[PDB]
Structure formats: C-alpha cells, structure tokens
Amino acid sequence: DTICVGYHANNSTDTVDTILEKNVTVTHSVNLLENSHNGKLCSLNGKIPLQLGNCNVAGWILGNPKCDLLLTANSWSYIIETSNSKNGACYPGEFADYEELKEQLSTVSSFERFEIFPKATSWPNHDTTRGTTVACSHSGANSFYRNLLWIVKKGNSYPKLSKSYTNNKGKEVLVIWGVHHPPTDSDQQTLYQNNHTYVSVGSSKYYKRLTPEIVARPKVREQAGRMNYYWTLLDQGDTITFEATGNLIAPWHAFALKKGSSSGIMRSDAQVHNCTTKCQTPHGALKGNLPFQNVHPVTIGECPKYVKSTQLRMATGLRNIPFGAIAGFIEGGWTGMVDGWYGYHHRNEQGSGYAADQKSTQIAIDGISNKVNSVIEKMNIQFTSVGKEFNSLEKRMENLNKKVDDGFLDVWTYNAELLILLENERTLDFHDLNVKNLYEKVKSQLRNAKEIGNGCFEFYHKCDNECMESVKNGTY
Amino acid sequence: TICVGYHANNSTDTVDTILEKNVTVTHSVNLLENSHNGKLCSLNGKIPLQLGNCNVAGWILGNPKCDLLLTANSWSYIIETSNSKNGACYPGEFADYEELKEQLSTVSSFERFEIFPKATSWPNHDTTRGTTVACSHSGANSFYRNLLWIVKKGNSYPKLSKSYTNNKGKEVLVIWGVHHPPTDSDQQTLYQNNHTYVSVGSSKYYKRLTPEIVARPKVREQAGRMNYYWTLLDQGDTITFEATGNLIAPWHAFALKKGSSSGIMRSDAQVHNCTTKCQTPHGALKGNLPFQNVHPVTIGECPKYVKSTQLRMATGLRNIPGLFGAIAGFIEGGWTGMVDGWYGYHHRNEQYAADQKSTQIAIDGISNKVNSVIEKMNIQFTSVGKEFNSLEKRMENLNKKVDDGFLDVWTYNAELLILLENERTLDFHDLNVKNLYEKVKSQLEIGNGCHKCDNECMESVKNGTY
Amino acid sequence: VGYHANNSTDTVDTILEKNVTVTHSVNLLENSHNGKLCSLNGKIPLQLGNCNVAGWILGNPKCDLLLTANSWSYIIETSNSKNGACYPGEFADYEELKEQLSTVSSFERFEIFPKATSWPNHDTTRGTTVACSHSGANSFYRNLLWIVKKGNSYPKLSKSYTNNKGKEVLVIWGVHHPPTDSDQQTLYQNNHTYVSVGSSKYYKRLTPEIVARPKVREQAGRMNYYWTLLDQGDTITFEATGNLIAPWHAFALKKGSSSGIMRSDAQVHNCTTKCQTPHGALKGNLPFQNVHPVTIGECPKYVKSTQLRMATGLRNAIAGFIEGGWTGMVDGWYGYYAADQKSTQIAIDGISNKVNSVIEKMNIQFTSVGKEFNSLEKRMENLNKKVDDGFLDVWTYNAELLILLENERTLDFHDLNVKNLYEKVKSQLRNNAKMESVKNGTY
Ligand SMILES: *[C@@H]1O[C@H](CO)[C@@H](O)[C@H](O)[C@H]1NC(C)=O
Ligand SMILES: *[C@@H]1O[C@H](CO)[C@@H](O)[C@H](O)[C@H]1NC(C)=O
Ligand SMILES: *[C@@H]1O[C@H](CO)[C@@H](O)[C@H](O)[C@H]1NC(C)=O
C-alpha cells in the first residue's frame, strides 16, 4: 500500500524561453503578443473613419470640386490618406504651414462647415460671379473651390475691400483664404484693375500683409499664375479682418471645430469595412486584448504597446514531462491526474487512483494569475499614437522624432523580453518548490512508512481510503 | 522546550508583491513623496523672482507697471502667475518670444546697464517726446524703461548710426523695437522721412526692416504697432543700429550670468520665507525619497516624478500575530512577544530571545537592497516646462511624447522593481526562518517550531553549541 | 561533494551584498578605444580637415583636395575646420544642409551650367576676388560662377536645368549684396535687380539690398548662399537682372545608411571597424560602452557605468558549513578529485544562456553624430538633449540594476547546485553510510 506525490502533465506542445534555458515545454501558458490583424480599416468603437480617397487634406479643406464627396463630412474617428490622395490645390500653389494644419485637424472630433462670408451679400461692390478657372474644371465647365471665393473687379473698379468676421461659434473656427499672383500685368489689370495691390489679414493673434508679385511660373493645369493658400484658427470672441486692393481669394466657407482625443491621420491603402474595433493600424485592426503587438508602430485607439519581439510567451504551468522535484527525484508528470497541478497517486487494496491537492493547486493558480495580471496591468495601453509629418526643410526634427520612437521601442522591447525570460524562470522554480513542499508535507506527516525515493511512500501498515483521504486532508 | 520563530508586531502597513496584493508586513520604508508644503520657497536660501502682475515681456521691455522688478538682480527661479498680463503696453509682437524665455530660464543673475546712454548717444535726434497714453504711469504718458522712442529733432531725422561692442565679459541681451505708425501723417510727425528702414547687425544677427503704415484695430487707443526684437550679443561682438526712422532704440540691456539651478515656473502659490532643495509649482518637497507624484515641473535636486500612488517596499516579513513553508507554514504565526529581532527562540524550563546573529545578517542585507534601489535612482535636476506658439503644435506634441514616454518608463521601473523585490524579501525571511529551524534540528520535534536542560544548556543551543 | 575554487580576484556587486569575490565573471562594458579614426566596414571616411561643410560644398579654393570626394562612410570635421565661405556670407538652412549630407552614400559632382557655354550674353571671366585668393591670384569658388555685366550691359538672365540623372541633385547658388551703389553699377549695370529661383518645390524672389556690412577679409559686401534638392524630372529655373552667383557645379546624390558628421581631431588610419567614436574605434563586441555617446556604426549602448561585471561562477552550503572551496579541483564547478560533468555542464549551459540572453536582447545604438541647432533653436536643442540624456539614464539604470539582480541569482544558483549534489549521495547511499558507482549514480 503506497502513496506518491507528483505533478501534472498533458499533451501540450507550448514552448517558452527562460533566462537559463530556451524552448522549454510547459503544461500551461499565455501568449502576450498579438501578431495578426484583420487586414481591414474598421470603425473605431462604432464611428467610421473619413476616407479622403483621391483627395488629400488640402483638396478636402480648400474644397477642390473633385472632393465634393467630403463636403457634408462632420464626424469621424480618424482620417485616412491613400497612395492616390493626390487631388489638392487644383489652382497651383502652396499651403503655408501645411503639416501644422494637418496636425490640427488630426485631433478634430467635430467639424461644422458654415458660410462665413455669404457670397450673395458680403461683396456688393465687387464681382463674385467670374472667379472660375479651367484648372478647377468640374463636369466640363470652369469652376473653383467650394470654400473660397475668387473675387474680381466689378466693371472697371476694384475698390478697397474690408471684411470682418467675429467668431461667436463657441468653438475655434478654421478660416482659409488665398492670395493670387497673376502671371502677367495684363492679368493683374484684367482681374483686379489696380496694380501694386496688397492683401492683409489680421486677428488678435495673427497678422500678415502680402504684396502680390507678378511672375510667370511654369504651367500647371494651364496656369502660369499661382495662389498661395493660408489658414488660421480663430478663437471664440476674436475677430479676423480682411483688407485688399486686389488678389484676395476670400473665405467663403469656414469650419467650427471641436477637438477630440482618440483621432489621428493615417496613411493606408487598405479598405474600410463596416467592422468595428478598439484598436486600428494601417495594415488592419487589432483585437487589442494582449499587452503587446508587433503588427505596426502607427496605432489609433487603445492598443497594445508596439514591440519588435516575434514571440512573448509567458509560463503559467510547470514543465511538461509525460529545487530537485520536477525532473528530479520525482522524475515525471502524471497525465492521469487531470484536475490540478500537484497531487497524489495511491495504490490500495481498494484500487489505484490519482487525486489533485486543491489547496496547494489553488494557491499556485491564485499566485500565477496575480503574476500575469500584474504584468498586464503594469504595461500601459497605447492610446492613439499616429504618424508625424515633416516638410523637406525639417529633416533634423524628423530624425529627432525618429530617434524618440526608436529609443522607446528598444526600451519596451528590452523590458518585455527580459521580464518574460526572468518571470518564466521564476514560475518554473515556483512549481518545482510547491511539489517539494508537498512531498515534505506527507513525509513529515507519515513520520510508519519509508521513502521509496521516487516521490512515493510504502506504508508499513494497511491504509484504506479513509487513511488515504486523511493524509491528503492534513489530518492523519 | 525551545521554539524557533519569527517576529510580529502591531503594524498595518501593506505591500504588493508579484504573487499577492495587500500583504501586511512588520517593517517597511516609504519611497514615494506625495505631499508638499503649498509654498514657493527660496532654493537653498536664494529668493525666487516673482514677476507678479508682469510677464517676461513686460519685465524685459520695462513696462512702467513692472518698475518694482528693477531692483531684482539675482534670483533662484522666475515665477509667472495667472495674472502675469503686463507685457507690451504699446501693442505689437515680440519676435521669437518662446526662445527668449528659453534663454532666460537658465539665467540666474543679470546686470541691467545703460547700453546707449540717453543723454549722449543721440545728439542729432530728439529723446524727450517718446511717450504714449498706452504706457501711462501715475497719470502721465510714459514709455518702457529699457527702450527709447527716438523722434525727429525740429523738422529733420538724419540717418542714425550707432554701434556697441560687448566688453562686459558676458552675453548681453539687447532688446529694441520697430514702430509701424497707423497713418502717413503720424509717420511724418514723428520721423519726417517716409520710406524709412531700420537695420540691425552683428556677427550672428542681421535684419533690415521697412516699416509699414497700417491702421490696426485699436489696443490701448493705439492703431499703430511696435514690433519687438532681441538678440544675445556675444563677448567681443559688435551690434550696429542704422535707421532713417521708426527705431525704438535700446536704452538698457542685460549682461547675463547663467546658473546651474534656475528656471521659469508658472504658479499662483505664494512666496514664503521657507527654504528647500526641491520646488514644484504646487509647493516645495522634502526631497528625501527617490520618487514623487506631486508635479512634473521641478526646480532643484528633486525626487523622480512618477504616476504612482504608492511605492511601498517591504523590509520586514509577513506580519502574523509562503514559499519555503516556514512563515505562514508549520510555524503558523509570529511572536508579538519577541521584540529584539526578526528571528529567534522561545524557551521554557525550570527557571523570548532574538537571534542577533541571524537577525543582523538579514538587516545588513535588506539595508543594502533598499540603499541600492535609492542610489541607482538618480536625483532629478531642474526640469522646467517648455513653451510653443500656435504654429509649433508638432514640436509641442514631440516634446509631450518625450515627457510622457520617459514618465511611463520610470513609473514601470519603480512599480515593477518594488513588486518583484517585495516577493524576494518576504521569501528571504521565510528562508532565513527555515534555516534557523534546521540549524536547531541539526543539533537535537512538536511541529510548530517547538533530557532536562536549563539556561546554560539552552543558551548554548542558541549559541550553536550542543 | 564540493565546489570549485581558484585564484581569481574578480569582484562583483549583488542586490544584497557588495564586493563579492567570484571564481569566474564577464565584463559587459567596453571602456577602451584604439585612439584612431578608421574606415567603417571597409569605406574610408571623408576628412574635411581645414575646410568646413560650407567650404567643401561651395568649393572654397582651399578645399580643392575635396573635389574628388564621391563616397565616404562618415564625414569628419576638426577643430581647425575653418575654411568656409571665403567671400563672407551664410547658407540659409545650413544645419538642414548638413543633416541632408549626413545621409549621402554617393556624390557625383557634375558641371550643371558649363561656364564656357552657358552665359553668352554675360561675362564669366571677372568674378574673382582677393577674398578667395589662391596661389597669389584673385579667385573664387569652384562650384559657383560670379557672373558680371558684359561691356556695359546685363540683360535679363534665364537658365533652366532639368534633373534627368534619375536621383536627387543638390543645387547651390548665391545672391550678392554689394556694399555701395557704385559696385552695383560696376558689376551689374542695373540699379533695381532681382534674382528668382524656382522649381516645383522651391520658389524665392530676392531683391538685393546694397548695404556696407563690416569688412570680412576686406569685403564690406556679402553673398547669401542657398541650396535645394532637385527631384528627378523637375526643373530649376534661374532668372536675374543682376547679383546672381550662378550654379557652376552641382551634385547628383544617393542616400545611404545613417552615418553622420563627427567632430574629431583623431587621425584617420588604414584600420577598419564596425563602430567609431570621436576618440577612437571600439571593438564593439560587448553590449555596453562608456567611451563616448557619439557613435557611428554598429555600436554598444552608451552608459554612465564605470563597471558592469557579471558573475558567471560561484564565490571563491557555500560559505556556510562548507567553509571554503577546493582550489585543488580544476576540472569543473561541482564534483566529488573528479568533476561531475552532468552537474557542471548543466550549469555552464545555463550560465552561458544567461550571459547570451543579456547580450542578445541588447540592441546596437546606431545613433547619429553632430545634431546641430542654430542660435534661435535653443528649445529644439534642449529637447534633443533631454532625449539623449533621458535614454542614457534609462540604459545606465537597466544595465546596473540587471547586473545587481542577476549576480545574486547566479551566486544562489551555484549554492543550490551544491546542495543538490550533496543530497545526491544521500538519495543514493541511503543507510549504507554516515565511488564510480555513486558518481555514475548507480550504486
Ligand atoms: C491534444 O489532444 C487533443 C484531443 O483531445 C487534440 O485535439 C490536440 O490537437 C492535442 N494537442 C494539443 C497540443 O492540444
Ligand atoms: C456591411 O454590413 C451589411 C449588414 O451588416 C452587409 O449587408 C454588407 O455586406 C456589409 N459590407 C459592405 C456593405 O460592404
Ligand atoms: C515723402 O517724403 C517726400 C520727400 O522725399 C515728400 O516730398 C513727400 O511729401 C512725402 N510723402 C508723404 C505722404 O508724406
């Protein structure tokens, strides 16, 4: 009549790495690394993104006629630019501080387009009906931006223009306008009558006075002239004032903005689908339940922390064998014991049988669960971290931004990789010691029997099922 | 009988471990400072500079409302409040203002000096009429203390030319302005000439401006504007001013000394006659622990800022009035009666004691653990806030990504280090107890740690001789 | 049963105790260099020597040796790199220019506007100056052409170049601001000139201003230098009525890996290295270095540590009832003299795995040298320094604390292997005691 102390074994092929040994097969484990995505752009928590499509932000904000899809867009979760987002300023010219404008829009959660200077009434002394061009052609007729008004002279007079707008929206207002540089003096006079004109735009936080220059630039969309585009964010209660003797591409529509938290701009060619997610990358959406991911650095939503690891497997059970206990004097696990991690086997006159010690097993399960959750809890969820954009004269800032991203990426990959290596080694020694503690618990309790040596004990006396379950209960 | 056992007391202190939360321990040491004195103090005896109702612009330009600041020549740090609103009393823009503040944040002392003495520097122009209602002082039109509004003498404004070579042995902050009158009549009244220019040149700075007659909306009755400019003139370098009008000339400049411990702070807390080695905008810190969660903005030698609400490190053992079966094992509880150490013996014969040998080794080891964690933690020298204009959002967000990124790293390092070291410290005591039992067992068994043998013989067993 | 002892005096720290003598250990810190500037993976660096980048790119005549430079591994500036714009003036966006050149792997100088044929209506033979004197004769930059009037006429200049090289072309030019109206008329005839330079990504129209600046090398005038990167298929167009210091040679560029500009006075030698610092080359085999924070190549992480000694063996059970090690046992870590290859090889495999894991998870720094900020970029400069210093503290902390914690685990690791060997005879001899059969484990 014998009893043995032993541990659990199963058919698991899970391997984990530890600080002392690599690829160790264990009975239970949890993967902490997401390495897959669904290959779709999804809504974030139910809110669709804004797909700029063939338009870029400039074409969107200016109101390029090819971007009319976007005019009613007022609410989105993030902004998508594709490889075909090429429709921008149809009348050629540069947007000043374009990357800053994009950075501003990347946190916008609500966008309300309104007619800041109504076309029909704002400009009684000028002509509002002729500012169209073949460069902004739409459905076979010369056209122009939906959000700007190309004002020209009325008759043969362009009087001094002055127009103010006071923001009473209760939110900041995005105002856009332009300054036109004709290619010849004849075009200057034809459009604006006066020569040597100026355009001045002012608020309490903004001031710029421009003198348009006449220069013939290389032809883009038949245009040797240029329009330089400008924008500013007007605060509640602040007043923006336009003054011009010509060349003013006036605001027609502007946008009352609310800023949110979880949005950004993403560059992706993947398709939007009517799926939803808490975490989106340019390649596809992530499930976002594990603390780490190696799919993409650019995330939007509440996302696992990005690491360069290819695997982050955490040991929870013990070494799978189907302080000298596991693979020691107790040379192997019991696949026959299924209800727990540590337990007993007994040979009897009434028959054989495995039983698991729930007391020590639950303590081990409680401790390891606390270990895993602590590792998950100490890792922070990676709120929206989008891409950042730099112009061609910002290489040092771009490289500074790149050094930051790469430095934290190395730090977090190191911390995760070493934590799992060290915690896995400690977890296996934890189980090893609990078995050794359980072996000594019966040995220091049957001391009437002799240590067979292999985790077992031969009872020098008859020991029935009552006698067995008594030793297990700790009351023997 | 002799019993091997461990210490227990009346402590309710709890610590977290990687395996268990809320573990009551007999001894522990706080590593997280979470309180402040609500005061702005001197740094090691050095008074801060309270700008009060003035901001940096008003101080540097010399807004007449900032005259009381003129007696300040050395400070430990600079304070702006929610009411620091007195700046440019004559409206207009300060160029590269966030850079000027960045430069001044490491200045600990400066010397205001009369770079172009008003009485002698401008013989061919008028220095006696450059006042405005916009800069009123005591009910009279006035002007900046550090700039001079030069106008025409009689009906002529000749070409102005003046140089200054910095021989102060320090960088000199030079400030000036260019006036943009609102009407051609005002241009003629003040400067006679039209189509004027102002040029300012040194070996590291060059700018030629043509003033523009423009009617801006009235601020403090002024439809005109003054644009302010500054530069740091190196030792041995020369700055040259040239103008046919519209020059708001330097009158006073500042020879700067940069110090190791100083910054600009935004705070509404009051200055008091306290001193501190570590200051935040909310109040001063004691600065004894390696971590603090009061504020990211520090001045002095300060604990590292973390987001943690508790950083509790175990030094004693589980408190019971485990891994190795001794503590919370066969010895089911601690001895409140044993007070002289962590591990020891209780004996009973015909006529509690602490094992000083076993206790001292563990005390020596745990002190080393705690000290190592403190020494590896570095003092956080002065880290102030940075400022960005409304067209510097990307840089502002890059700066914030850096602050937040290192903040998350150090919060992780502190919290997880404590979580893992607490587990090892409790397992350390548990193992030291099992070793004390097995040492007695290897000499002489009831089970709970417990020939006639009096005191000489027992105390010998404690001594290890039997 | 016993453990190994030898004559090593190596000391290591652990979280629980400092200065513990160990039988074997490994240093994880490279703290020495060969005091030489070497080639990187086989590619010679570019020594600017007494020229700075401006003098190199403009083609200051004192920089003629550099004209053959087409491929380098990194660029070296010395404390005597002072030959720049010999005719005084500055490059707009000069730190950006340097940042662009810091990543260039191929450089092909070509004659964008051939001086003998590009300017038939202007004079190409008089744009020389005592300020750029060479071999006792007035001279000028090798890469720019100082065009002046032909006879008494300076007609409107118009020259385009279309980039068809299939790679970016660095184009450089200048705009001259004479000190007096007489010099303006003498050089360019016209009084109210302009220079406009345009591509699809660049446009600037400048009106030169006649101003007498302080004399630098006898020049009261100034030349403002400009640069741009012209994309494939794009056209740059120059138009001017005077004051144009025109392109003469430009540069077809290929972008390479993340090398940089180094400030160093060490001498270049015919050595090669995987990792270079301004003080000297590193062997680059260990995961950490404290030689210099400025690295180029595949380099160990920079730390503030003076020592990073990792225990691999045991202290010279241990230091308990067994009051000492056997200096006489030489064949292994544990044994009975004979060493147990099972017990010793298992520990060697594990400790070798621990050492390798610390090294394997450590990444190369791959940093960048010479981040420069102008005098109005102090906030950006301080931001860059906050990043460098912040990671320095993190890695110094991670390295030092890792070594403290793993050393304690290593010394207890050996201690437990001794107890397991000691218990190995007890679970074998049973009650037959108070040889090769016990060692084999079959007794
Ligand atoms: C284990 O056995 C089950 C059948 O019960 C089988 O489906 C599975 O593939 C086997 N292997 C693992 C690793 O679970
Ligand atoms: C979108 O969802 C609807 C209903 O869930 C489904 O009919 C449709 O196929 C989905 N995909 C589309 C519209 O591309
Ligand atoms: C500008 O100055 C000139 C002198 O050169 C004078 O004749 C003219 O009247 C002035 N113009 C105005 C508007 O004051």
Numbering used by the authors:
A (entry chain F): 3 to 324, 332 to 456, 458 to 486
B (entry chain A): 4 to 324, 330 to 359, 363 to 455, 459 to 464, 469 to 484
C (entry chain D): 7 to 322, 334 to 353, 363 to 460, 478 to 486
Sentences reproduced from the published study:
Hemagglutinin (HA) is an IVA surface protein that allows the virus to attach to host cell receptors and enter the cell. HA is a homotrimeric glycoprotein, with each monomer composed of two regions: (1) the head, comprising the receptor binding domain (RBD) which is crucial in viral attachment, and (2) the stalk, that is responsible for viral and cell membrane fusion in the endosome. Mammalian IVA infection is initiated through HAs binding to α2,6 sialic acid-linkage galactose receptors on the host cell surface, before entering the cell via endocytosis. Following endocytosis, HAs undergo conformational rearrangements due to the low pH of the endosome, leading to membrane fusion.
The full length mature HA1/HA2 trimer crystal structures are as follows: (1) A/Fort Monmouth/1/1947 solved at 2.95 Å resolution, (2) A/Jiangsu/ALS1/2011 solved at 2.35 Å resolution, (3) A/Almaty/32/1998 solved at 2.05 Å resolution, (4) A/Hickox/JY2/1940 solved at 1.95 Å resolution, (5) A/Netherlands/002P1/1951 solved at 2.5 Å resolution, and (6) A/Melbourne/1/1946 solved at 2.55 Å resolution. Comparing the structure of A/Denver/57 HA in complex with C05 Fab to our six other HA structures showed differences in the C05 antibody binding site. Val148 and Ser158 were both highly conserved, with one exception being A/Jiangsu/ALS1/2011, where these residues were Thr and Asn, respectively. The antibody C05 Fab failed to bind many of our other IVA HAs, as examined by analytical size exclusion chromatography. Failure to bind correlated with an insertion in HA between 146R-G147 of the epitope, whereas sequences without an insertion bound the antibody. Our other IVA HA structures all contain an insertion near the C05 Fab CDR3 binding site that appears to prevent antibody binding, via either insertion of an Asn which becomes glycosylated to physically block C05 binding, or insertion of an Arg, Lys, or Ile into the C05 binding pocket. Although the insertion of either a glycosylated residue observed in the electron density of our structures (A/Netherlands/002P1/1951 and A/Fort Monmouth/1/1947) or of a bulky side chain which partially changes the loop conformation (A/Jiangsu/ALSI/2011, A/Almaty/32/1998, A/Hickox/JY2/1940, and A/Melbourne/1/1946) appears consistent with the loss of C05 antibody Fab binding by analytical SEC, rigorous mutational analysis and quantitative binding experiments would be required to prove these are evasion mechanisms. Interestingly, these insertions do not affect the identity or the positioning of the sialic acid binding residues, allowing these strains to bind the cell surface receptors while eliminating nearby potential antibody recognition sites.
